[PDB]
RNA sequence: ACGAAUCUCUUUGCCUUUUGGCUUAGAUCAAGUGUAGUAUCUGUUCUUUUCAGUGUAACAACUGAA
RNA sequence: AAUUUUUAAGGUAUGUAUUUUUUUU
């Protein structure tokens, strides 16, 4: 009559999963939040308009700005760069560099 | 200012198609019954094969145009507004409805 | 006893609270390592809530403040609710102000992918056997239950349009001609 | 149950857990077991990626490297970095476990060490040169010798590299390639 | 049982695993008292024999 | 919590408030009834207690 | 043909299963009734629309579309007999009259509309209706 | 100039799953450490007067006075 | 000054395919 308790289990397999597995899950979701859900494309994939359009992922996993040729560890770093004064300049330089030709 | 009830709207569209039709008639000028059986009451009406094909083509054409224009509003709609954070298309679409609510 | 919040773990709250709302705090700490729910909530209310007021102090406030703090002796939540400010700010100015005086979705998706793959497989089987001349028909997915229907075999529930006075009877012929034309095409050009 | 167990802080545990993958891979088969290991290189924590990289070296020796190697050379393509080191580290181990053999398998790995020594981040250029130290010593005297000029042409520009773990790995490579070339 | 409970595991237990009660002490109580709790003299009850044993 | 909403037609708000006062009255009345039933000792089952104490 | 046959069959399992569950949601009926049109089978498509008039006959997008599929392939006395059933069911409506009137314009027959407006005036509709007459 | 057709464009208008329900928020549960070392973002300062020494592959940098 | 005896169910899923004599070009 242990039904009095009120806990139970499903009959499938072996539950909890392994602490390492939780981190993989948690570091994907955190990079989904901060990314605001955008799919940042790989560098080799042969271009869904991007929110910006410069950020990518190299053949490795890292994120890169293709203007500035900087390498970034995480989305948090990227938003630092996109809000930086160097990534400002390289847009202006490409601004002029286009405004001198068509 | 303002909305329009489904009556007045119906009338307006009626007039619109009247004008369009009259233009087909004029341009066609520029380029240049009832029988009921005794056995059954079934009525029959003589028809010109022309203008019926023209009708079908008109309906199909207008459907194509409408579908396309709405499609262009689809395209611009998503490409215009990049301000707030969004996880997916559906989110952005909803928040543009929030822009309509203002 | 630090429990100190880096600007990353502040930036993940505001994205988590945006997602999960303010009463699901147990889920916010799933996105955020190092931090429990009671730690996440306590920061959202004391710091990060954008409806909080962190701003300079007008001349009426320090009058309003020193009025309350005198009329209510130490009660810094009750004062802060009067001032519409976080307490530890309304406390912290008051201590300086006194020294101013001083000197399923995924699973079904993937399963559907599997099913479609199986279809593709059987189809290309039939095409290859056809290329060798042996012709084999496709199979019916058995019957789950006794009365189960095969939709192709028959019009499911045929509701005759109605009778009517205008007596079509001719248009039906042209239709059937177009239909038999369609199927007669597919046997050859194959769409 | 072992693959979860090598999180342990003890060593003799971690060491015996890897040895019993060889005893199982001999029993049942290598490919059933690899897919268990390779799925575990995505994991972040370093012990787990190194202690899988050992096990793939052990499954290679015991069941033969030809069974393991094309599954590892394929896994190297994945764009995550932690895989790409773990597949280069696994190849270091498996070339010191099969000591003399290693000659049969060169020519296949020169293109895999081609992208490693060419790659931008400094750790790949560390682990591939740590493959060359094992691959040069015990394949010297074979008569490849034109694979080690290729592999040399790619290393020497790393002579200017700083970092302590990077520069000793590269010197070890240059000391070892000296015995393949002369 | 007061001895070793602490170190079972920590994070890992599933809900039932952690919250539910162990049947193990009741089994100990009904083994020790078995020959009264199982006795043939009963007022109303039916014999069964376990599969491979001679235990009624 | 008060449940104000930004622009919502007033009549709809009237409706929702009306039905929520009905449901609130039933919810409270059952909270009391089950509670006196528990007090005097009558059998209230189990989760009706655990449910009750949340209501109270 | 099996590259076709099993396509049509599998679709008719999916669409009916949904409509089986939801009697309402006319958005599905029109879609599924459109699928059977593009297969060049009028018999099935007419059944679907007729099946969907039972669920709600007050929904004019359904009524209108089922005039289209009749007019597009030019089945005349059907879309003609239909309009007997159409405006006798919902005689107040605006759109249903004008779409029956304006389609009679492109058929050039003014005797019809002469007698149409006879009834539609006999019904005493209102301002915008009379002004078209 | 005008009756007037067609393509292109802005606006008004029309609008999409604008979250499947219910109860005691239905209940409950969560982050290892130490030694050595590298990689990568952002912020802040300088392209600005002469000569003498230190320094550098050459710069740079550092050190004095008008 | 006299009680009263026990069986089921909520726990070990559920689903699909599988033994077939070659339907006329
Ligand atoms: Mg259960
Ligand atoms: Mg039940
Ligand atoms: Zn940049």
UniProtKB/Swiss-Prot annotation, chain B:
Q: Which domain of life is it from?
A: Eukaryota
Annotated Polar residues bias: 20-32
Protein location: Nucleus
Transmembrane annotation, as ranges: none
| Family according to the record | Belongs to the SYF2 family.
Subunit structure, interactors included? Belongs to the NTC complex (or PRP19-associated complex), composed of at least CEF1, CLF1, ISY1, NTC20, SNT309, SYF1, SYF2, and PRP19.
Q: What does this protein do?
A: Involved in pre-mRNA splicing and cell cycle control. As a component of the NTC complex (or PRP19-associated complex), associates to the spliceosome to mediate conformational rearrangement or to stabilize the structure of the spliceosome after U4 snRNA dissociation, which leads to spliceosome maturation. The cell cycle arrest of SYF2 defective cells may be due to the inefficient splicing of TUB1.
Reproduce the miscellaneous comment text: Present with 1670 molecules/cell in log phase SD medium.
- What name appears for this protein in its UniProt entry? Pre-mRNA-splicing factor SYF2
Native species: Saccharomyces cerevisiae (strain ATCC 204508 / S288c) (Baker's yeast)
- Encoding gene (name): SYF2
From Swiss-Prot, chain D:
Location(s) in or outside the cell: Nucleus
Q: Which cysteines are joined by disulfide bonds?
A: none
Q: Which domain of life is it from?
A: Eukaryota
Coiled-coil annotated spans: none
The subunit structure is: Belongs to the CWC complex (or CEF1-associated complex), a spliceosome sub-complex reminiscent of a late-stage spliceosome composed of the U2, U5 and U6 snRNAs and at least BUD13, BUD31, BRR2, CDC40, CEF1, CLF1, CUS1, CWC2, CWC15, CWC21, CWC22, CWC23, CWC24, CWC25, CWC27, ECM2, HSH155, IST3, ISY1, LEA1, MSL1, NTC20, PRP8, PRP9, PRP11, PRP19, PRP21, PRP22, PRP45, PRP46, SLU7, SMB1, SMD1, SMD2, SMD3, SMX2, SMX3, SNT309, SNU114, SPP2, SYF1, SYF2, RSE1 and YJU2. Interacts with RDS3.
Q: What is the similarity comment for this entry?
A: Belongs to the SF3B1 family.
Question: Main role?
Answer: Contacts pre-mRNA on both sides of the branch site early in spliceosome assembly.
Protein's name according to its UniProt entry: U2 snRNP component HSH155
User: Which source organism?
Assistant: Saccharomyces cerevisiae (strain ATCC 204508 / S288c)
- The protein's gene is named HSH155
Question: What is the covered span of the full protein?
Answer: 730 to 911 of 971
From Swiss-Prot, chain E:
The signal sequence is: none
Compartments where located: Nucleus
- Return the annotated region ranges for Important for branch point selection: 8-21
Name the domain of life this protein comes from: Eukaryota
> Which additional comment does the entry carry?
Present with 468 molecules/cell in log phase SD medium.
- Sum up the protein's function in the record's words: Functions as a scaffold that mediates the ordered assembly of spliceosomal proteins and snRNAs. Required for association of BRR2 with the spliceosomal U5 snRNP, and the subsequent assembly of the U4/U6-U5 tri-snRNP complex. Functions as a scaffold that positions spliceosomal U2, U5 and U6 snRNAs at splice sites on pre-mRNA substrates, so that splicing can occur. Interacts with both the 5' and the 3' splice site, as well as the branch region. Has a role in branch site-3' splice site selection. Associates with the branch site-3' splice 3'-exon region. Also has a role in cell cycle.
Q: How the protein assembles, per its UniProt entry?
A: Component of the U4/U6-U5 tri-snRNP complex composed of the U4, U6 and U5 snRNAs and at least PRP3, PRP4, PRP6, PRP8, PRP18, PRP31, PRP38, SNU13, SNU23, SNU66, SNU114, SPP381, SMB1, SMD1, SMD2, SMD3, SMX2, SMX3, LSM2, LSM3, LSM4, LSM5, LSM6, LSM7, LSM8, BRR2 and DIB1.
State the protein's name.
Pre-mRNA-splicing factor 8
Species of provenance: Saccharomyces cerevisiae (strain ATCC 204508 / S288c)
The shown chain, on whole-protein numbering, covers 1578 to 1633 of 2413
Swiss-Prot record, chain G:
Name where the HAT repeats lie.
6-38, 40-72, 74-106, 108-133
Q: So which residues are the signal peptide here? A: none
Places the protein is found: Nucleus
Task: Say which family it is in.
Answer: Belongs to the crooked-neck family.
State the protein's purpose.
Involved in pre-mRNA splicing and cell cycle progression. Required for the spliceosome assembly by promoting the functional integration of the U4/U6.U5 tri-snRNP particle into the U1-, U2-dependent pre-spliceosome. Also recruits PRP19 to the spliceosome, as a component of the NTC complex (or PRP19-associated complex). The association of the NTC complex to the spliceosome mediates conformational rearrangement or stabilizes the structure of the spliceosome after U4 snRNA dissociation, which leads to spliceosome maturation.
Quaternary assembly: Belongs to the NTC complex (or PRP19-associated complex), composed of at least CEF1, CLF1, ISY1, NTC20, SNT309, SYF1, SYF2, and PRP19.
Anything else the record notes?
Present with 2140 molecules/cell in log phase SD medium.
* Name of the protein in its database record: Pre-mRNA-splicing factor CLF1
Which classification does the entry list for the species?
Eukaryota, Fungi, Dikarya, Ascomycota, Saccharomycotina
Quote the range of the complete protein represented: 40 to 172 of 687
